[PDB]
């Protein structure tokens, strides 16, 4: 009885190049609770990412928000990388400022 995480990558505020913001990775719908989440800046691990306290929805499936301060630009690429027992390999979801 295992459920694969849904993954959303997005900012707290609409994205503006050069303006400070928060980058979020929200992982939800998953079971069991152990999960590895990294925020990436040009392929590389952002240090001291924070996350919310483990919670779950009415269907018992878990959810977590991982986040870090960031200043988006035109050329800097952002992504969330997630591993879980339901995935053969870590799944990378790239930040799209329109999603």
């Amino acid at each position: 009885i295992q459920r694969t995480p849904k993954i959303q990558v997005y900012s707290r505020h609409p994205a503006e190049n050069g303006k400070s913001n928060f980058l979020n990775c929200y992982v939800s719908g998953f079971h069991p609770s152990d999960i590895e989440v990294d925020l990436l800046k040009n392929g590389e691990r952002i240090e001291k990412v924070e996350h919310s306290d483990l919670s779950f929805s009415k269907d018992w499936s878990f959810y977590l928000l991982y986040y870090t301060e960031f200043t988006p630009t035109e050329k800097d690429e952002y992504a969330c990388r997630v591993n879980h027992v339901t995935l053969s390999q870590p799944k990378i979801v790239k930040w799209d400022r329109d999603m």
Binding site: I1, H31, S33, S52, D53, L54, S55, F56, W60, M99
Partner: protein, 276 residues
Amino acid sequence: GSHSMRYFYTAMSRPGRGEPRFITVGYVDDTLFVRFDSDATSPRKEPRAPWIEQEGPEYWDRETQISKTNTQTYRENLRTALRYYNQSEAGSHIIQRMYGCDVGPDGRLLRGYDQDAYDGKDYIALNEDLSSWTAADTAAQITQRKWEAARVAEQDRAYLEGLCVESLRRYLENGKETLQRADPPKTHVTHHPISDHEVTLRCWALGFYPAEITLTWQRDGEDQTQDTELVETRPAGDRTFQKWAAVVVPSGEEQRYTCHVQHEGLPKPLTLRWEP
């Protein structure tokens, strides 16, 4: 008017990596207010919202002791569960619990909850009568028999009708600036052509509280439920939530589409269209 308080337990066994981890979080509506983690350096109930900080030392000690005591209880429940399902001690398993109360405008009990899951599946639930139980399988029937014998339902009922609603009413007063404030969504429609003859219309709702919202696209006044892409409501990280709905529409047909927004922060439902 209407409000909820919920506590959420997760108890996870991890053979070879110490004793089961026990985590509790408490919410009023969609606002997290307390946390406990048995893996913390010095495990205690900790404030997660400013209005719970008003509670005195006696409160924090009592709450911490309940969490410490329940860490043990839920560790035993995991051992018992193994026996009920004929499982080995080498696997990792999870028990979850959600319990609490809803109150209406007058602050009286609307309904109480106390339910458990095992490995992500319904195990046992206190019924809405706060008097009987529903067991999901023959294992949980064993638990039911034990709880029926010890009159557990009656004890849950006294909590759910007393302390649960009283403390929630106190929290609602102390945090009224936030708990009793609805923030309406900021809304707009975006337009992304995908090809010469198809375009994506995306209807946004940002900065709203509480989480509950409805976003629907209509074509010629008809709900496009099957053709709408809806993302799960997601937290912004500042207490508020975000959501979007999208449809792929024929080029030249954008104005036949209206986005509809319902949220308790709004006086009336909103209708939006692509504003070229």
